[PDB]
Design a protein around this ligand. Structure first.
Ligand SMILES: Nc1ncnc2c1ncn2[C@@H]1O[C@H](COP(=O)(O)OP(=O)(O)O)[C@@H](O)[C@H]1O
Ligand SMILES: Nc1ncnc2c1ncn2[C@@H]1O[C@H](COP(=O)(O)OP(=O)(O)O)[C@@H](O)[C@H]1O
Ligand SMILES: [Mg+2]
Length: 214
């Protein structure tokens, strides 16, 4: 199974990706995480990016597209994967068609602008695993600590309010057209498309997805 998750930053994509990956065995492919990690190591594809992310602007299409192509060439993706943050522009989506990468499901998280900032300002991550927390809406069991390793959680550098607003503008300009893009792909039968209410609590969004994916 191959899945794309669409939605504003802070819509809940990464959070729900973890559950999908655990129930259905397909890895999460999060270009944001890959970029943030490639930034960290600085010895692989996608090293050039910290200044662009930190502005809240998208990395250039070709770079990301390659990074994903290499990432899905790994043996763990061969039976399925979950794209989370990719494609993020019409060129990235067209490059998937160009490369012969079909998708079985596109899952749209509906979450209004007015909820996005509180979500992202309170976000805490465990980078090594991708686990995502929210200090209030989905907290670690122990404040400040990853549930599994006990490692102290971090804040992403792009999770500041000012930056989050510019990201949202950028999102509505370059990435929201993907909604219509994959709706048209679904009307033509080339994918299954579904819209979920991403304002519900985490466990309810989780249950709504379970009911779509069987
Ligand atoms: N597919 C992509 N194309 C271009 N830039 C990307 C892509 N994915 C991630 N980025 C960069 O990473 C940043 C954060 O991405 P991401 O972790 O997915 O944010 P969020 O978790 O809020 O959805 C983006 O603002 C952008 O600079
Ligand atoms: N359904 C939800 N309701 C409230 N907060 C949520 C929900 N889903 C995720 N969050 C929290 O809001 C933030 C954004 O979620 P996240 O999955 O990182 O979004 P994305 O990957 O879309 O950028 C995180 O701190 C997460 O814990
Ligand atoms: Mg995310």
């Amino acid at each position: 199974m191959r899945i794309i998750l669409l939605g504003a930053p802070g819509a809940g994509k990464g959070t729900q990706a973890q559950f999908i990956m655990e129930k259905y065995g397909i890895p999460q492919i999060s270009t944001g995480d890959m970029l943030r990690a490639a930034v960290k190591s600085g010895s692989e594809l996608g090293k050039q990016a910290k200044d662009i992310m930190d502005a809240g602007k998208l990395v250039t299409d070709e770079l990301v597209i390659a990074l994903v192509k290499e990432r899905i060439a790994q043996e763990d993706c061969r039976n399925g994967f979950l794209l989370d943050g990719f494609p993020r522009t019409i060129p990235q989506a067209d490059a998937m068609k160009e490369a012969g990468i079909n998708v079985d499901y596109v899952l749209e998280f509906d979450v209004p602008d007015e909820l996005i900032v509180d979500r992202i300002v309170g976000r805490r991550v465990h980078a090594p695993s991708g686990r995502v927390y929210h200090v209030k809406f989905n907290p670690p069991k122990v404040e400040g600590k990853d549930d599994v390793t006990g490692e102290e959680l971090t804040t992403r550098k792009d999770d500041q309010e000012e930056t989050v607003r510019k990201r949202l503008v950028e999102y509505h300009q370059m990435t929201a057209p993907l909604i219509g893009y994959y709706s048209k792909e679904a009307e033509a039968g080339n994918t299954k498309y579904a819209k979920v209410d991403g304002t519900k609590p985490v466990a309810e969004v989780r249950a709504d997805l379970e009911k779509i994916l069987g």
